[PDB]
Each structure stands twice: as C-alpha cells, then as structure tokens.
C-alpha cells in the first residue's frame, strides 16, 4: 500500500522552570520508532520499535547530535516568536513541527511535508510544489521572507526527495513483517438492554493495524449515522488499535441491524450481526 | 541522518 515517514517535534517554553523542553518522535505509518526528550538524564535518540533497535552506533550518534542541535534551534525560535508576536517573556508557549514524506506502493515519492505551528495554530507550511511556502499570519510572513531569501525550500526539497524517501524505504524493508502486513480487526457485536423496549448494539473492532478504519451500522441496509455513538480510534498499547460504533435499537429487531467493517487488512468488507 | 538537519531559524 501507500506509506509515510513523519517526525513530530514539540518545543515548549516554561519560564522560571528551566530550559524549554524539546520532544521529538518519529513514525512510519502508525508505528512510532524513535524518541528524543531533552529532559532525560542523558538525552539521546532512542529506539521505540523492534526493527530500528538493530541500527549501529553511527545511526544513534548522528540522530542524537542532530536532535540536540534541533532542541537548541527551537529554544531560539521560541524567543524569536515572542518578538514577532510582541508577547512577554512570562508566558509558556509551544512550537510544533510535522514533516516527512509519503511514498506509493512502488516506493516512489508522492508528497513531501513540512508544517509548523505556534501555540496550536498553523504558522508556516511548505507547499506541495516544495518550492514555496504558506504563511498563516503576519508573524509567519517575516519567517517566510527570511526562508525565501535563504533558499530553505530547496534545502527541504533535497531532503524530502532523497534521504527521507531512502530511509523510509529501508525501514519498510527492515520491518516489512509488521509494517507491510495489515492486521485485520477481530470483530464482535455485544448486546446491552437499556430499557423495557430498547437495547444498545456495540460493534467492536480490536487489534487492527493500521489505524485507518470505518465502522457503519445499517438498519435493513440503510446507513444510520445520526444514531451511532462513534468513539475515536484508540491505541491498544501493543501497536494495534480499537474502535466501536454503538446504536440504540428496538428490543426485537436487533437482528435487522448489520455492522459494516471497512479496513485494509480485510480482503472484502465484513458484515457483522449480534449472535445471541 | 534520517531526521532533517535544519539550516536556519524562524
């Protein structure tokens, strides 16, 4: 299928409580594989998935030196953002960054990304052409002008079209057994009587990977969207996900309700029903 | 490196 590598940085100032904290996390699709925390006793890039643990000391050293340099850059960016927004040094602020590449089934680059936020809102993003930027406010336009003059999009493009893709392609091979093998959901329908004439029909989906899934209830083949209590997809804690869709049905016609499970791990979409 | 080596600030 299609794949992606993403790195996520969070830089948070905390005046009076020490240096701003910098946290970086790396993912291949929905699997976290690396972490860096500037608050650790000995900050270092460390493995978070089994298939990256094998990497040699040159890998861990290189990522660690880069993450320490990025931690200090985002401490300086936090100070710059205060001047751009005319904010005082007393408040706590956050910069967030998301970047990486998307590849097709052939391993070829489909799209590069490099987006930033300041205090939970878009700040600046690299456009799909990887040669121009979108600034979201007048402070980000100062960064846009600076980055356009310093040729930053060309530097990002060279990384996104090269090493971002090359490393993603290596991780997908090294970890092909978990990364390239979709785990279909283990599904079941529970029944819980809520009243004398009504019952709740919960359509569960467990241990599926990747996280993208679609659960839909149907009353005699008709898609019921307003009567569905749909929960956000949540992690099981073992690199698999869970999701449920519950409906309130009249006690008697429970079997006229069919759950339609849509997932990459299933050859054909599944159809479920409560089996007493 | 697998991560981006940044070359500028904001």
């Amino acid at each position, epitope marked *: 299928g299609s794949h992606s590598m993403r790195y996520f940085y969070t830089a948070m100032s905390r005046p009076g409580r020490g240096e701003p904290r910098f946290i970086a996390v790396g993912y291949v699709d929905d699997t976290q594989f690396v972490r860096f925390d500037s608050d650790a006793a000995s900050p270092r890039m460390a493995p978070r998935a089994p298939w990256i643990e094998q990497e040699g000391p040159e890998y861990w050293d290189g990522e660690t030196r880069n993450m320490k340099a990025s931690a200090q850059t985002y401490r300086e960016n936090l100070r710059i953002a205060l001047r751009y927004y005319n904010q005082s040094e007393a408040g706590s602020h956050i910069i967030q960054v998301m970047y990486g590449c998307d590849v097709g089934p052939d391993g070829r680059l489909l799209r590069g990304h490099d987006q930033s936020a300041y205090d939970g809102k878009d700040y600046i993003a690299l456009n799909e052409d990887l040669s121009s930027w979108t600034a979201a406010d007048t402070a980000a336009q100062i960064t846009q002008r600076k980055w356009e003059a310093a040729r930053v999009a060309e530097q990002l493009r060279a990384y996104l079209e090269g090493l971002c893709v090359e490393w993603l392609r290596r991780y997908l091979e090294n970890g092909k057994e978990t990364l390239q093998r979709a785990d279909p959901p283990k599904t079941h329908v529970t029944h819980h009587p809520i009243s004398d004439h009504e019952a709740t029909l919960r359509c569960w989906a467990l241990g599926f990977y990747p996280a993208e899934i679609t659960l839909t209830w149907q009353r005699d083949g008709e898609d019921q969207t307003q009567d569905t209590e749909l929960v956000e997809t949540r992690p099981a804690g073992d690199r698999t996900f869970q999701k449920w869709a519950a409906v309130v049905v009249p006690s008697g016609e429970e079997q006229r309700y069919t759950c339609h499970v849509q997932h990459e791990g299933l050859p054909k979409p599944l159809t479920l029903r409560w089996e007493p | 490196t697998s991560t981006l080596q940044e*070359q500028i600030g904001w």
Partner: T-cell receptor
Framework: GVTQTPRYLIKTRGQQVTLSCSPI?????VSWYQQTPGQGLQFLFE???????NKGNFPGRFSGRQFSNSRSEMNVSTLELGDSALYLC??????????FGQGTRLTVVE | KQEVTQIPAALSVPEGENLVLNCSFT??????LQWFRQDPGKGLTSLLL?????REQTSGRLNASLDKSSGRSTLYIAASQPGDSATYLC?????????????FGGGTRLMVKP
C-alpha cells in the same frame, strides 16, 4: 564575508591555540577544516545552534564551540609540529553554498 | 564514504589553449558542487557553483558541467591565460547537510605558460 582571526599564529610544541570565525551576518552553520600540503583539506566539525552536529576524524585534542550569535571557535590542545597548517572555516545558511574565511595560518615551532 | 577525485593532479598548458579540469565523486546524492581556486599563501576563492545536471554554469571564460548520475563534473577554461595558474579544487556537499560541509578533491595544479 566570513572573518577569521588571527590571520597568522606562531605557537610552541605542547601549548594550546584558540581560533575564531565570524560567519556572514545571518549565517547559522559553521564548519572547520585543516589544510596541510600532504593531507589536503580535512573536515574537523560542523556547528549549528551551539551544537557539534557533525564531526570528522580528528582526536579529542581538536575541539570547538559556537555561541548564540553563531560565532565559532576551534581549539587545538598539546600542539605537535604536525599541527602546522592553514585552519579554514566556512559558513552557510538554509540552502546556500559554502562561504569561506581567509584562514588562520598556524606554525608550531620547536 | 564520499570520495572526490581530480585526475590529473597537475597540468602544464601553453597560453591560448582550451583546457578541461576533471572531478569525480562516489556518492551521486549531492546538493551542491563548487569549484574553487587557491593561490599560493592564500585561502579559497569560489569560482562556480553548480546544482543541476541539465543546467550549465558560466562565469566569463569559466564554464562548468555536472552529471550527478555518472558522478562527474568538468570545469572548462576557454583560451587559457597565465593568470589562470593556480590550484583548482572541486568540492561536493551531500543532501541534508549544511552547504559548508564539503568533501574536497585533491586539486589540480594548473600552470598556464606564456
């Protein structure tokens, strides 16, 4: 342009030197190189945001630093006669090419 | 792992003749290629920067070509002059590295005799 100081230095065997590099205003990364007639231009280390982000193959007595204003220094401990060389720094920013200073010509004497 | 080679390492050319200087590099995933000249008792003088294999950078009588796939670059000097005499260095920077991080070739000492 990039400015390096001192332009020329004479030091004695066993002592220490500290060389300075002021990159072009606004440049954030600085790399240091040693050029000897017999080994060509050899990379020492790259500094970005006060951090030694990349390092070459010189021993621990070849060290460096970079300040918040991007100015960088390099230091050589226990100077050997073989350490006599032109020490070059180069700066860059974003997607630019390298801009080099005029070097420090160091001669370690008996 | 990146290795940059300049062969021949020395060239002695009569003035007026066109000349070519060669550069090869083992890792094709480069961002920049720079040609420099170095005069005795001096540092580096940037001559040309090239980044695209389809484009060709020129600076007067100096012209440079690049072929990333083959790992090759050429610096052309039309109608050489004695003032062109110097050591010519080619250097390459990888993608996702600062432009100031170069792997240098060994250089070609060019002597253009009057």
């Amino acid at each position: 342009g990039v400015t390096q100081t001192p332009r020329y230095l004479i030091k004695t065997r066993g002592q220490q030197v500290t060389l300075s590099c002021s990159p072009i205003s606004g440049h954030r990364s600085v790399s240091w190189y040693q050029q000897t007639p017999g080994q060509g231009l050899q990379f020492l280390f790259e500094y970005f945001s006060e951090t030694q982000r990349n390092k070459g193959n010189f021993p621990g007595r070849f060290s460096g630093r970079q300040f918040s204003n991007s100015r960088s220094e390099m230091n050589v401990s226990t100077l050997e006669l073989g350490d006599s060389a032109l020490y070059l720094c180069a700066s860059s920013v974003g997607g630019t090419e390298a801009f080099f200073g005029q070097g420090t010509r160091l001669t370690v004497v008996e | 792992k990146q290795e940059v080679t300049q062969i021949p390492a020395a060239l002695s050319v009569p003035e007026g003749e066109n000349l070519v200087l060669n550069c090869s590099f083992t890792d094709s995933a480069i961002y920049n290629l720079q040609w420099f000249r170095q005069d005795p008792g001096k540092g580096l003088t940037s001559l040309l920067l090239i980044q695209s294999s389809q484009r060709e950078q020129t600076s007067g009588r100096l012209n440079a070509s690049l072929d990333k796939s083959s790992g090759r670059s050429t610096l052309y000097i039309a109608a050489s002059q004695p003032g062109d005499s110097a050591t010519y260095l080619c250097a390459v920077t990888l993608n996702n590295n600062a432009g100031n991080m170069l792997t240098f070739g060994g250089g070609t000492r060019l002597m253009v005799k009057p």
